[PDB]
Design a protein around this ligand. Structure first.
Ligand SMILES: [Mg+2]
Ligand SMILES: [Mg+2]
Ligand SMILES: [Mg+2]
Length: 141
């Protein structure tokens, strides 16, 4: 659901600043991770793919194939209030997106394409949070 997605995003997004330098992710491309969810933000830069790899590896959310670690993701989403309602759905969505971009050779590009797909499908499924909702939870934890 949208509130669980907001907590996941608020928390995961804390690692964006430490990942900017090594990814090339200028604040002019993405200032706050919460904006990932705005209708007015296109999820397309290779640099954001590179940032997402960086951020994910902080929390061991990707495996050695630079794909989602399913068990670690499920455990992560379960760590938030009401997380069990999103965990299986979110892993499914991410994995179903991964399979669409398995032929992309560039890991950074592959992950940003997976990310745009996940945002799309999340909007479609009605679990995509508003930027306001992510912001409302930024203080936690
Ligand atoms: Mg770099
Ligand atoms: Mg470029
Ligand atoms: Mg690792």
């Amino acid at each position: 659901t949208a509130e669980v997605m907001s907590h996941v995003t608020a928390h995961f997004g804390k690692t964006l600043e430490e990942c900017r330098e090594e990814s090339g992710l200028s604040v002019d491309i993405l200032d706050e991770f919460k904006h990932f969810w705005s209708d007015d933000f296109d999820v397309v830069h290779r640099e954001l793919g590179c940032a997402i790899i960086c951020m994910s590896n902080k929390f061991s959310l990707m495996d050695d194939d630079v794909r989602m670690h399913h068990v670690n993701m499920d455990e992560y989403i379960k760590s938030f209030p009401n997380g069990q309602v999103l965990a299986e759905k979110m892993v499914k969505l991410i994995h179903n997106c991964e399979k669409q971009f398995d032929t992309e050779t560039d890991d950074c590009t592959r992950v940003v394409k997976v990310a745009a797909c996940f945002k799309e499908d999340s909007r479609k499924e009605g679990i995509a949070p508003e930027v306001a909702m992510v912001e409302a939870v930024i203080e936690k934890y």
